[PDB]
């Protein structure tokens, strides 16, 4: 027959990450979780497309140029006439949520409109993170996009990727995020995120707490220990090569990029061997992404990833 | 008798200027026009104090640490619980307003409150720029501070320092700025600013247009040609050494710093010889400030300034 490379849509925040380098200097690094995933998929020769809003400013034009250079489809990237592109300062002493300071609140992406959503098609993927749910109108626009992708027979990937300070009403984060968890085909958590969102003290408890959601695939990253893969009535650990991280920025998005790339090119992404293989790629991408400063810098192509996987 | 070094109060925006340096890098430079003037006065061994608002964030704490290191009194620098410190990207191909992109709108300084204003005393100075007038509540708070300084028998310095993009209602800029021009003892313009604000095509026309304001001292900077000094029924050019600029960022604030330092230590700042001498210092400071990247970096001490003046 013929191969079927499905398009992956990414939406949310494209951001400039200011990363200390020699510091009284910052590296000007392209970033923003869904932009990172888009570039990760494209670098692996996948088919990714971004829709959303950046600012009509140099940082916004920098992110548009970056995504375009990386062969990400940006036909549906919009430039807001008023609001500025997200600008984030990174603390290299931390990893994850604790490492980021958001200087632009609310940034242009928070003003995502219904009209920004492109036509979706059966079999396509949509990936979203929680910053897209942080404030209106992006929150309601993003939930509408999710419902539309489900309706047309596409698939939904959700990575909470929690950044509480972005929420003008942080008391709304837990419920809003769990509503999106309830819409997804694929959900990726860090260990801490799963426990926080479900109010549990163990991964096992956390998984039992969302069993009612009947999620096809839940993946819980375990840092160096790889990832727990949860499918209906089944859990297993998939572990890869451990590396000493130089810059953890973007590791989780790289992980999601490898995962979604392999799901997107699969005959049937629900196939258990397909999923386990996709997580092996995800682990490899996550490790490699830490080897250079910047979320996107070390996102691997297939030659590099295969060489690393052995 | 005894010398009388008057305190100069500065209020408005303290900002982090991101200046290309090796660029895919930015230099992280302390800045913001009234913060620049405060540091310029302190470096010349004057008595400067800052009141206003920065964000409760690393950039805000960086500016507090900077002003403190520079011996600027920061007892009245406040940290806003919600809004972020102003962050500005600099274009080295431009000078003045055209070189700055404001990423944080509205930044913490725009939320200056009546309670942020310190007690003023007779003979003290207050210096303000137009960003403090850009939006509420800072606009009304700053006009209140101005009226209070006038009432107690202090002096008011105003440097429009126009940055239109900071105004949520830019159609209000001209009238709002000219209202402040009408309150000042000392006003400093660039040539372009004077003509723009008065809607005239020459400096001479611009000066005639504000004659009705009965301003004690108007200074119009002329780039390398020095400055025009306008006092009642009198104008003269004061020119100093021309330098080849390396980074024009902060030149105008350095100029104001030298000017206000010498006015602040004078027996009678209205004295014409005093004023002309103060402008000679101002010119020297303006030139020296261009010799390094960053608004504050090359603000001179007296040893450097005297050596440059000859
Ligand atoms: N030292 C490390 N060695 C190998 N892989 C790592 C390492 N750190 C992170 N990763 C990889 O990248 C993924 C992301 O790691 P993680 O710390 O859980 O990021 P996040 O909390 O954002 O999900 C891991 O699942 C793992 O596959
Ligand atoms: N090439 C230059 N050579 C000497 N002095 C300069 C030079 N450029 C700027 N200055 C000094 O610094 C001041 C500020 O210059 P200017 O270009 O008018 O800045 P601004 O437009 O912000 O007021 C000048 O009045 C002048 O005294
Ligand atoms: O996941 C890493 C990414 O997440 C963010 O914090 C927000 O989207 C970015 O600053 C960073 O590149
Ligand atoms: O006058 C120079 C200063 O003016 C600003 O643009 C705003 O206050 C700063 O970015 C800069 O340091
Ligand atoms: Ca993450
Ligand atoms: Ca100026
Ligand atoms: K990295
Ligand atoms: K400079």
Residue among B129, B138, B183 nearest B295 (CA) = B129
Report yes or no: B89 at the A interface, CB cutoff 8 Å: yes
Chain A residue closest to B89 (CA)? A58
**CATH no. for residue A194?**
3.40.1190.20
Residue among B170, B53, B162 nearest B107 (CA) = B53
Do B255 and B225 meet the contact criterion of CB atoms below 8 Å apart?
Answer: no
State both tokens at A157.
Answer: 């990937």
Calpha distance A7→B41 (Å, rounded): 60
Whether cis (ω within 30° of 0) applies to the bond prior to B106 is: yes
Whether cis (ω within 30° of 0) applies to the bond prior to A137 is: yes
State both tokens at B51.
Answer: 């009141």
- Altogether, the residues listed in chain B come to a count of 310
Q: How far is CA B62 from CA A200, B28, B65, B198, in A?
A: 38, 10, 5, 38
- Total domains, chain B: 1
Report yes or no: A104 at the B interface, CB cutoff 8 Å: yes
Half-sphere exposure of A130 (CA within 13 A, CB side): 26
Q: For residue A97, what are the domain limits?
A: 1-310
Report yes or no: A62 at the B interface, CB cutoff 8 Å: no
| Sheet with A25-31, edge to edge strand ranges | A100-102, A86-90, A15-20, A25-31, B25-31, B15-20, B86-90, B100-102
Calpha distance A9→A35 (Å, rounded): 10
Calpha distance B192→B106 (Å, rounded): 26
Header resolution in angstroms:
1.7
Q: Please, which contacts does B100-105 make with residues 24 or more away whose CB atoms are closer than 8 Å? A: B100/B163, B101/A57, B101/A58, B101/B165, B102/A84, B102/B163, B102/B165, B102/B166, B103/A57, B103/A59, B103/A84, B103/A85, B103/A87, B103/A103, B103/A104, B104/A84, B104/A103, B104/A104, B105/A84, B105/B165, B105/B166, B105/B168
Atom of ligand 3 nearest to the CA of A99: 6
Half-sphere exposure of B62 (CA within 13 A, CB side): 17
Q: What kind of experiment solved this structure?
A: X-ray
Q: Which residues pair with A285 in a beta bridge?
A: none
Q: How far is CA A10 from CA A38, A62, A72, A76, B149, in A?
A: 6, 18, 10, 10, 55
- Say which of B24, B58, B102 has its CB closest to residue A89: B58
What Rg, from alpha-carbon coordinates, does chain B have? Answer: 18
Helix residue spans in chain B (DSSP H): 33-43, 58-69, 138-152, 173-181, 191-198, 203-209, 251-265, 272-289, 302-309
Q: Which residue out of A26, A55, A63, A88 would a mutagenesis test of the B interface target, given it has the greatest number of B Cβ atoms within 10 Å? A: A26
Residues 6+ apart with CB under 8 A from B131: B12, B13, B33, B109, B161, B163, B166
Residue A231 φ/ψ region, left for φ over 0, alpha for ψ in the -120 to 50 degree band, beta for the rest: beta
Residues on chain A touching B103 (C-beta within 8 angstroms): 57, 59, 84-85, 87, 103-104
| Sheet with B8-11, edge to edge strand ranges | B73-80, B48-55, B8-11, B125-129, B155-159, B186-190, B217-221, B227-231, B234-238
Atom of ligand 3 nearest to the CA of A253: 1
Calpha distance A196→A27 (Å, rounded): 32
* Alpha carbon of B50: minimum distance to chain A alpha carbons (Å): 23
Q: How far is CA A197 from CA A29, A128, A190, A201, A215, in A?
A: 30, 17, 11, 11, 15
The SS3 assignment for B223 reads helix
Which residue's alpha carbon is nearest to atom 14 within ligand 2?
B252
Say what the alpha-carbon torsion angle A39, A158, A33, A73 is, to the nearest 10 degrees.
30
CA A61, distance to chain mean position in Å, is 21
Q: How far is CA B245 from CA A144, B37, B290, B291, B298, in A?
A: 54, 19, 5, 6, 12
Ligand 2 pocket mutation pick from B287, B289, B300 by most atoms within 8 angstroms of CB: B287
- Taking CB atoms and a 6 Å cutoff, what residues make up the pocket around ligand 3? A 13, 15, 17, 31-33, 36, 88, 100, 131, 161, 163, 250, 252-253, 295
- Say which of A23, A28, A84 has its CB closest to residue B105: A84
* DSSP-derived secondary structure for B114-125: GGGPPPP-TT-E
Report yes or no: B26 at the A interface, CB cutoff 8 Å: yes
State both tokens at A8.
Answer: 């992956």
Q: Which residues pair with B187 in a beta bridge?
A: B158, B218
Calpha distance B178→B201 (Å, rounded): 17
In chain A, DSSP assigns E strands to 8-11, 15-20, 25-31, 48-55, 73-80, 86-90, 100-102, 125-129, 155-159, 186-190, 217-221, 227-231, 234-238
Calpha distance B247→B120 (Å, rounded): 35
- Altogether, the residues listed in chain A come to a count of 310
In the DSSP assignment, the letter for residue B41 is H
Residues on chain B touching A85 (C-beta within 8 angstroms): 103
**Cα A129-A138-A123 angle, rounded to 5 deg:** 55
Residues of A with a catalytic annotation lie at 253
């Amino acid at each position: 027959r013929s191969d079927s490379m499905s398009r992956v849509w990414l939406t949310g925040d494209a951001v400039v990450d200011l990363i200390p380098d020699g510091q009284q200097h910052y590296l000007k690094c392209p970033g923003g979780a869904p932009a990172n995933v888009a570039v990760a998929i494209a670098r692996l020769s996948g088919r990714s497309a971004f829709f959303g809003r950046v600012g009509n400013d140099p940082f916004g034009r920098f992110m548009q140029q970056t995504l375009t250079d990386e062969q990400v489809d940006c036909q549906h990237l919009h430039f807001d006439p008023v609001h500025r592109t997200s600008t984030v300062v990174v603390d290299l002493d931390e990893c994850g949520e604790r490492s980021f300071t958001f200087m632009v609140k609310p940034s242009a992406d928070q003003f995502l409109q219904l009209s920004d959503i492109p036509s979706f098609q059966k079999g396509e993927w949509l990936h979203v993170c929680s910053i897209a749910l942080a404030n209106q109108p992006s929150r309601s626009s993003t939930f509408a996009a999710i419902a539309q992708m489900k309706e047309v027979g596409g698939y939904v990937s959700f990575d909470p990727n929690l950044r509480e300070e972005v929420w003008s009403e942080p008391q709304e984060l837990q419920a809003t995020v769990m509503r999106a968890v309830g819409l997804a085909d694929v959900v990726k958590f860090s260990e801490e995120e799963l426990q926080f969102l479900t109010g549990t003290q163990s991964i096992e408890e956390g998984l039992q707490a969302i069993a009612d959601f009947q999620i096809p695939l839940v993946v819980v990253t375990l840092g160096a220990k790889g990832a727990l893969v949860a499918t209906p009535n089944s859990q297993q650990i998939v572990s890869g090569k451990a590396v000493k991280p130089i810059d953890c920025t973007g590791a989780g998005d790289a992980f999601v990029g490898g995962l979604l790339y392999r799901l997107s090119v699969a005959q049937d992404w629900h196939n258990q061997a397909t999923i386990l293989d996709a997580v092996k790629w995800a682990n490899g991408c996550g490790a490699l992404a830490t080897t250079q400063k910047g979320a996107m810098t070390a996102l691997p192509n297939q030659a590099a990833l295969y060489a690393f996987l052995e």
